[PDB]
Amino acid sequence: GLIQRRNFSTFASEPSVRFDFNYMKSVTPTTEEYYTYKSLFEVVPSTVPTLDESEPFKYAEIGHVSKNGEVFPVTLSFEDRDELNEDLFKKIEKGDIFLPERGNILISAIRPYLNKIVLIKEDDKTDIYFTKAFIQIKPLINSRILYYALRTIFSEKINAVSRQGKGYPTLKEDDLKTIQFSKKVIDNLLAKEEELISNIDALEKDIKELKSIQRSKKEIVDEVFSSHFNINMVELMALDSQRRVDVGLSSISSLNSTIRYSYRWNKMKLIQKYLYRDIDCIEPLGKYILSSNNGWSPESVVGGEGIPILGQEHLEFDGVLNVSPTKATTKTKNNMENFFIQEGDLFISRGNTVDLVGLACVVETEVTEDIIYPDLYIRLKIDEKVIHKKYLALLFNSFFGRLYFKYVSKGKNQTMVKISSNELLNYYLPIPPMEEQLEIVGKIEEQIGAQNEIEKQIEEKRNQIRVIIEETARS
Amino acid sequence: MKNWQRIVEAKLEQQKHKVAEISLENGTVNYSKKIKHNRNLKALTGDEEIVRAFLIDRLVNELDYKPEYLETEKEYTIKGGHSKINPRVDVLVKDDKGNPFFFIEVKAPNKFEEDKDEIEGQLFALAQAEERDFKTKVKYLVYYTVELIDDEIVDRAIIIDFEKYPTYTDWSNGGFISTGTELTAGYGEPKKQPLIKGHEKYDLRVRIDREEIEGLGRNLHNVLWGGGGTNDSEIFYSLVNIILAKIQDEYEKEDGQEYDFQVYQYGDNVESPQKLFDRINALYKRALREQLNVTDEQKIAEDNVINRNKFPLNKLVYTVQALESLSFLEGRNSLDGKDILGDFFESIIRDGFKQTKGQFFTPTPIVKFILYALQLDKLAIDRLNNDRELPLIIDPSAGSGTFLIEAMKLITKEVKYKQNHKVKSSRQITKRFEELFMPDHNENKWAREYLYGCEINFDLGTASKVNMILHGDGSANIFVQDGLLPFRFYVKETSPNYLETASPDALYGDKEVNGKFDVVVSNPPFSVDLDTQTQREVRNAFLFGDKKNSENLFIERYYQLLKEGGRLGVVLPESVFDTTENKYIRLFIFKYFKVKAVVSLPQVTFEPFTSTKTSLLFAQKKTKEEVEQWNELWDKYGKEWSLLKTRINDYFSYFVKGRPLNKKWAPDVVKDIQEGNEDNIRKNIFRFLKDHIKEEDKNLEIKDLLIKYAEEISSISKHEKETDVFGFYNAWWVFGEVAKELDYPIFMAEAENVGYKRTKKGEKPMPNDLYDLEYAPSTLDCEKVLSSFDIEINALEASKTKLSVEKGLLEEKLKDKEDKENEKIQKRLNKISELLETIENQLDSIRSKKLEVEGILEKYYENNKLKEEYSERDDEELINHFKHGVLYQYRSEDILLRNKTVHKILDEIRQGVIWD
Amino acid sequence: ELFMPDHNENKWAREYLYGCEINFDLGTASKVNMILHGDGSANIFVQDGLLPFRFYVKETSPNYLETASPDALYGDKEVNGKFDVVVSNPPFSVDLDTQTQREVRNAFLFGDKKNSENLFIERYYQLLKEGGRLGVVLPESVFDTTENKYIRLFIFKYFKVKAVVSLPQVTFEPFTSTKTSLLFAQKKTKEEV
Amino acid sequence: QLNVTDEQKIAEDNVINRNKFPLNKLVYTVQALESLSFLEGRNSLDGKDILGDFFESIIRDGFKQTKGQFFTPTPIVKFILYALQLDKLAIDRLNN
DNA sequence: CTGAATATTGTCGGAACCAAGTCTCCATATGGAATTAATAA
DNA sequence: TTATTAATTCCATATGGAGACTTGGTTCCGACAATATTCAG
Numbered sequence A: 001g002l003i004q005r006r007n008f009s010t011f012a013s014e015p016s017v018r019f020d021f022n023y024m025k026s027v028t029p030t031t032e033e034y035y036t037y038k039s040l041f042e043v044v045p046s047t048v049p050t051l052d053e054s055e056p057f058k059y060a061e062i063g064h065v066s067k068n069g070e071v072f073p074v075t076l077s078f079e080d081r082d083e084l085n086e087d088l089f090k091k092i093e094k095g096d097i098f099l100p101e102r103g104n105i106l107i108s109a110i111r112p113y114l115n116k117i118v119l120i121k122e123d124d125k126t127d128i129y130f131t132k133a134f135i136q137i138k139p140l141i142n143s144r145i146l147y148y149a150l151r152t153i154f155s156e157k158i159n160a161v162s163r164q165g166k167g168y169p170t171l172k173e174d175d176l177k178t179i180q181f182s183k184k185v186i187d188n189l190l191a192k193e194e195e196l197i198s199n200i201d202a203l204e205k206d207i208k209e210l211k212s213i214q215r216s217k218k219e220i221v222d223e224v225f226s227s228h229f230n231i232n233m234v235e236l237m238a239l240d241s242q243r244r245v246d247v248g249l250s251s252i253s254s255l256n257s258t259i260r261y262s263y264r265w266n267k268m269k270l271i272q273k274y275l276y277r278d279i280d281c282i283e284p285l286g287k288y289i290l291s292s293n294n295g296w297s298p299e300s301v302v303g304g305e306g307i308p309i310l311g312q313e314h315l316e317f318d319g320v321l322n323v324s325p326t327k328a329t330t331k332t333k334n335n336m337e338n339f340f341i342q343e344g345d346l347f348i349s350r351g352n353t354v355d356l357v358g359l360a361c362v363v364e365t366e367v368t369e370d371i372i373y374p375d376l377y378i379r380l381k382i383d384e385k386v387i388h389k390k391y392l393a394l395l396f397n398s399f400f401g402r403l404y405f406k407y408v409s410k411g412k413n414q415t416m417v418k419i420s421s422n423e424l425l426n427y428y429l430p431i432p433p434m435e436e437q438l439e440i441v442g443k444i445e446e447q448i449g450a451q452n453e454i455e456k457q458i459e460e461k462r463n464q465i466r467v468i469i470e471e472t473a474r475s
Numbered sequence B: 001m002k003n004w005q006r007i008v009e010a011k012l013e014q015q016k017h018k019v020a021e022i023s024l025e026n027g028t029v030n031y032s033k034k035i036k037h038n039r040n041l042k043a044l045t046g047d048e049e050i051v052r053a054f055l056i057d058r059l060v061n062e063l064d065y066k067p068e069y070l071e072t073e074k075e076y077t078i079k080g081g082h083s084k085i086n087p088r089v090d091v092l093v094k095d096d097k098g099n100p101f102f103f104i105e106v107k108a109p110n111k112f113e114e115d116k117d118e119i120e121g122q123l124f125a126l127a128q129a130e131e132r133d134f135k136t137k138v139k140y141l142v143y144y145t146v147e148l149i150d151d152e153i154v155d156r157a158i159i160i161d162f163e164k165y166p167t168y169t170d171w172s173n174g175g176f177i178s179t180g181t182e183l184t185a186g187y188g189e190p191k192k193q194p195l196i197k198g199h200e201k202y203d204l205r206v207r208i209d210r211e212e213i214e215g216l217g218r219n220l221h222n223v224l225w226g227g228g229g230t231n232d233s234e235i236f237y238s239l240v241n242i243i244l245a246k247i248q249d250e251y252e253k254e255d256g257q258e259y260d261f262q263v264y265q266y267g268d269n270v271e272s273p274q275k276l277f278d279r280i281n282a283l284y285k286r287a288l289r290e291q292l293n294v295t296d297e298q299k300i301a302e303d304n305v306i307n308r309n310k311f312p313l314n315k316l317v318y319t320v321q322a323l324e325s326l327s328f329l330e331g332r333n334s335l336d337g338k339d340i341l342g343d344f345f346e347s348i349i350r351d352g353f354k355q356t357k358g359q360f361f362t363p364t365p366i367v368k369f370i371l372y373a374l375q376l377d378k379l380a381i382d383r384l385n386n387d388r389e390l391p392l393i394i395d396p397s398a399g400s401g402t403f404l405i406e407a408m409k410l411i412t413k414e415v416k417y418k419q420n421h422k423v424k425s426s427r428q429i430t431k432r433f434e435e436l437f438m439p440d441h442n443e444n445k446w447a448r449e450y451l452y453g454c455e456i457n458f459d460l461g462t463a464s465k466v467n468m469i470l471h472g473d474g475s476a477n478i479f480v481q482d483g484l485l486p487f488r489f490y491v492k493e494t495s496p497n498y499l500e501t502a503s504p505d506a507l508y509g510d511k512e513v514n515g516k517f518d519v520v521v522s523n524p525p526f527s528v529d530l531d532t533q534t535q536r537e538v539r540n541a542f543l544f545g546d547k548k549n550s551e552n553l554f555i556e557r558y559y560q561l562l563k564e565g566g567r568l569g570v571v572l573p574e575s576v577f578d579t580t581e582n583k584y585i586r587l588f589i590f591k592y593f594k595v596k597a598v599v600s601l602p603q604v605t606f607e608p609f610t611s612t613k614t615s616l617l618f619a620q621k622k623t624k625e626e627v628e629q630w631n632e633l634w635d636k637y638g639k640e641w642s643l644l645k646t647r648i649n650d651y652f653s654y655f656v657k658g659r660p661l662n663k664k665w666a667p668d669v670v671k672d673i674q675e676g677n678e679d680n681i682r683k684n685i686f687r688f689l690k691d692h693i694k695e696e697d698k699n700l701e702i703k704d705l706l707i708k709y710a711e712e713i714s715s716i717s718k719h720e721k722e723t724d725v726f727g728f729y730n731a732w733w734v735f736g737e738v739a740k741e742l743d744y745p746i747f748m749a750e751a752e753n754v755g756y757k758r759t760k761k762g763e764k765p766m767p768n769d770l771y772d773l774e775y776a777p778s779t780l781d782c783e784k785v786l787s788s789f790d791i792e793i794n795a796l797e798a799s800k801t802k803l804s805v806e807k808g809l810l811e812e813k814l815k816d817k818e819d820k821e822n823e824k825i826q827k828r829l830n831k832i833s834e835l836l837e838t839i840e841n842q843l844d845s846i847r848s849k850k851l852e853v854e855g856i857l858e859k860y861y862e863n864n865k866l867k868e869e870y871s872e873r874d875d876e877e878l879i880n881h882f883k884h885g886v887l888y889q890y891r892s893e894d895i896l897l898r899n900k901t902v903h904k905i906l907d908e909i910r911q912g913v914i915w916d
Numbered sequence C: 001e002l003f004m005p006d007h008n009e010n011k012w013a014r015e016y017l018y019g020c021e022i023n024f025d026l027g028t029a030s031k032v033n034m035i036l037h038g039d040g041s042a043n044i045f046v047q048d049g050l051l052p053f054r055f056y057v058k059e060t061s062p063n064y065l066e067t068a069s070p071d072a073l074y075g076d077k078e079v080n081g082k083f084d085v086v087v088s089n090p091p092f093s094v095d096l097d098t099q100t101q102r103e104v105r106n107a108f109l110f111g112d113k114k115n116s117e118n119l120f121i122e123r124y125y126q127l128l129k130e131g132g133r134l135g136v137v138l139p140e141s142v143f144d145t146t147e148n149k150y151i152r153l154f155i156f157k158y159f160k161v162k163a164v165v166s167l168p169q170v171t172f173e174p175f176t177s178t179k180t181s182l183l184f185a186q187k188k189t190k191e192e193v
Numbered sequence D: 001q002l003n004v005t006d007e008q009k010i011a012e013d014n015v016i017n018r019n020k021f022p023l024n025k026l027v028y029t030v031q032a033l034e035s036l037s038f039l040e041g042r043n044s045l046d047g048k049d050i051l052g053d054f055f056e057s058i059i060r061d062g063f064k065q066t067k068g069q070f071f072t073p074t075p076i077v078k079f080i081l082y083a084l085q086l087d088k089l090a091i092d093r094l095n096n
Numbered sequence E: 001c002t003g004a005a006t007a008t009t010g011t012c013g014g015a016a017c018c019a020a021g022t023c024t025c026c027a028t029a030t031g032g033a034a035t036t037a038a039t040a041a
Numbered sequence F: 001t002t003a004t005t006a007a008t009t010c011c012a013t014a015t016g017g018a019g020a021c022t023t024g025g026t027t028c029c030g031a032c033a034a035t036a037t038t039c040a041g
């Protein structure tokens, strides 16, 4: 760890005479002609607004605000106050609400390192109320300049005054009033304005345009799979909401082989019967399976010194292994080679939530190093003449595999529902001809590749939007 | 080559009966009728005959009882292990008469280690089988062995009769009873047990050697815990109370007088559970009067050792009767080296305590880091080398004695073995050294006068006392009462009571101060709530007793306990360091302590129990000659602050608010308003804002300065609220001035990984930032370790010679058989040859690793030591060899106290901050 | 005699309401609750729930939880067929006591498997009358998984399953959050087995 | 109320262990429950098992894991009895 | 008739923290292997 | 006339766990100022 050395006098920096390590990691003699909170901003005391009842107002907690300074408020109305959102209305009635005045900045008080600072823009409409967990400041200088100087720069001095105290690392208005902002950093940004606002505005509107067409990695798989097979997605989500199945005693042993009569199995049967009403290409998977080798999960330390190991978070709805190992072991089992990922392998997740169990992916990434797949991965070397593994993985990630594994995953603990080899061998999935399987794969490969390219341009723009600020400040 | 083996072999080749001189056979000498054998071989059969021959000699030499011919019975059947076993119930003594009447099982001092189910394996369990097959009347059963005990070589045996318990299950319920200790001539012995008369005969069986600790630990856990409905902890506490009762029984009893920790099998009938409970409870209810220092007759009489309905009586009988046959006071011998019952208790603690969250322990790495960061070994050496005295380590929060046992082992291993070079023999120093350390069987006797602790929990206090006694020490110094009481309450009924004196202090609230201890290591509770009556009873002995932050009261108690110049090490949470509310406690610490070190521990130290962040705090209590200076400064900069407050208030009233001039303000306030004198007012307004002003404000008008700095003038114009200690002055201004005048460097460090990561499913090694282990031991006996390698060499060479023996046996069978059996002989010979290449591929690697180990010792260890250029153990090549291979067997689980360079937090703490 | 004295109306409780608990503290708390709600803390046995029926000694005239005789179509094992409304929440995968392990190899059909949550189903069968009702809370692993086939087969032989409803994981949110389900079955008469 | 007929157990048993349980803590506990009406007050607090909820809140989950110390919530229990038609069964048994 | 001190009226400040989301090593059968084995020409 | 079991070892493997670690931020009690109070000199 760090080894510093400070003096007694340095305990006089704050009237709270704190002497914690985190606060004084930043404390040091200063030569820059620092500014203070008086010149830059002004803390605005919070007040409880008089909300009307007819108009549905919009509320936002800390969790609704994103890391990149976006708000996703919840539309609440006193007219429809049910028990699901009763807690929010309880907070509102208690008095944890305030309407930000236009142009202010709202810094979150809890956990500053997430950089959850939001700016109320001077333009636009439909103002949104916020939880008093934020802190209002009125920037005497240009609001956008202070906003960008607080998000990108000064992100470590704000994090150097947070108070943990047997729990949440939180801030206080006094902590902000204690900050020691520099002069050159702020005056360089303020003087070089009228272009450092135009460039950032253009880049932000480009980012907004890119986000305007973004789609999730699951809807794309759902869209094309719904395009084929002529599946009414609206009716499927309606039959899934039914909570009443009345089967008979005779229809318990049909294709059971182990006498399972739980409600989940009996609703699986109904859903699978509904899904295949018009599709006639279905054959059991157990025919086209050659092996079901599991993985190896030794005791692993995060960021250790040894062979890397994958995790359940590296399987995405796309169908490609993320190959982003985090955990590392140093233990051997005399059979290391059999538990190393190879190009073309088909891995299915074994053990997750009821909605994320059974996700499959093909490696499709040439990596020369050896990476262990945990025992929560089932590798499925199969017959490469009818299945076309990519198609199988993307079928499993689709609603055709997200509903079967949602109701066949055995387990007492619903948080780690697991699938066994028997479910894989007894799964009746639709197999179209090899030519027909290739067409879908091309579609939900090109569309998702375009989506990923969208996901890459936005990151590059958001990185240069702060590189510009850094180079402007330090100049 | 075991200790007993050499003497017993010497008497095998020096038999007074002349029965074992002929090796590998005895068929041509008298008293060798054992129905040959039934499975394989009639020759040397290990340790069994080695001691059974001497037993036969003793039977004939001194026991006599006429010579006859030692005509014994035949072998029965046992289904033990692979294939049925046909044993001759070890050795036999004439079976008295034709039918089996006497059974003896010869064992060995080292054989008590491997197996403990053979105490009755050929005894009771098969005794009924003999009585049911041959219809005999077996009555007398011997668990015979003679270890090394002087010329008399007295048998430390467990001899039992077969008239008390019809079956062996009831005998086990009778807790491994023994109706005989020493073999008696003339066919005598009492029918019932000879009891536990503590003079001679049975004694107390004080030679606990090895692995019977593990046998008992597995036995107690598999029976007492069991299942059903309980919650582990109370079972553990009941066992602790039983051990406490046994310790009290050993304390109170004298020569003879038997022992109350028995079963008292009157004749043949076993004890009724009620009377045994009454006896054990009387032992326990008198233990409290003598050990727990309780005086309330009502409390000491309205209780019991076990809760009955949550602890069945059969379990009580089994425990109370199995726990004997080993002294809990002096029984620790570990064959040779002592300290064997401690490891037993930490085996018990680990398996069954269920730490949960309410009762967790400071992890041992943290405790050792705290002890070394205080330079406890150096302080102890200096105190012994100059004052002929040891420190007075205390623990006001105590617990399981975690902070005390570690300190005990630390001092013993650092002043006696590792750093005794620092101790110089100067007669009186040597006198103290032999008075406190030299007796190995009572090496932990110094800490009968130095270690102290206070545990509020009754069960935790009892467990701490039991841990304290088992290692061997005067646990009477731990008080099971509260730790936040006046010193008069801590009454020890023997020895000097350092935690009893009290006296009001001049410059501390005119309150009691013990001021006798030197080191105060503790881990205060994270959030204690106390209660109304308790809070009212304690808000007179502490300055900040009114404030309901009782956790902070411990620091005040730490000041009250430490003498002038003592050392303090704590595990205080971050709230002391960061939270605004706990501002008074920081000022108190700065006033009465010289803060010398602080380590920001990571958020994973107590991860399975609680995620609250903590930071170790180290300090040295200031002497009075510095507290007086602090008090003088606090007034010199307090009067100035008050005057400045008055002047600034007047200036704000006039210049800003425009109030009419009043001549009654002050002679210096209304002296320059008419004359202007802006600079004089400017100096005052700057000085009042000692750290708020900026250079750019040096040009603003007087009115603007008091307006710009408004909403802050009032903030720096308030006293210290409800506090009569700091006075009616803003501490922040006064403290800022005092710290400027009284400034000293302070160590500052943080740790991101302590070395462990405990979870609900065990723990796992992690990188360590606090300290570094030693791995390679400092001193390793080259002859001893090389003898261990040579022992493994010849152990494998024995298998090599055996395989060569079958090779020679079968190399002549090829010509003996032509085709049919020849094919099988050839196949067996081929696989024997394959085993030969396997064993030679073992042997060549064995030789290569012998050579590399010898190279390691020569290039690193010189001669039974470690070279000065490698003593720091910073070389990666030296370390890793001990981390792998067979050297990992020895290793060294000791913290490396490097003082040449810095590589871990502990290194620069011992090389940085100086304790004066 | 049962429902008329307003002051003390819970008189039938002593003679028409039984219960077993293995923890003495829990037993005392349960008895305190019974006397809080109008007495009835006479049949709360503080002994184990899977012990032989002859062990449940009580100091009163009616001791219905004592009768036990071998049953023809059960493997000749003790059956106390008098109770009707058997309801409980078995401990899931709890370790049986070593002393009780002696008496589980006998008097139980599948008594060779140390599985607590499945042994109590058999004990219920030993307790319901020939026509009694059984509403129990069981883990979803009983109704699923391949290692529990015998119990599911065992239930379908002697019992006549009437309903099963899967509770949400929000049931035991602070404590364990395990997927459980309520099973409602009625014992079949000997003329049906 | 518990019908303990033996006069010896009553002479040796106790409400609390004054050594395990400090007496000032007993004072506080009595003070907290002085005004409370456990009897005749249970009607208002319908569907609230005080003693069981106290066990759940006090005993750690670590001890409630080895043994199945997980109490069924009251809403479920009222559903189990009403789903079994226990009311109708009791009425029929009383009638016939 | 000028209080300040206790009914309380709504607001800060922390917390032996703690829900939400979702990712995990390991004890334990187990059976198909091995083994011994008895079929029987 | 052997070599088929079917038991008794023994392996790496499949299965499942009243789970359990990670990350982020939430309620609620306790002060507490400021309501009010509050009786009195």
Ligand SMILES: Nc1ncnc2c1ncn2[C@@H]1O[C@H](CSCC[C@H](N)C(=O)O)[C@@H](O)[C@H]1O
Binding pocket: B359, B360, B361, B362, B396, B397, B398, B399, B400, B401, B402, B403, B454, B455, B456, B457, B460, B482, B483, B484, B522, B523, B524, B525, B528
């Ligand atoms: N005056 C007091 N007030 C509260 N707890 C006290 C106390 N005096 C001693 N203790 C004990 O201090 C313990 C805090 S945890 C003990 C420190 C650490 N776990 C160790 O074993 O060394 C509690 O279990 C409590 O029983």
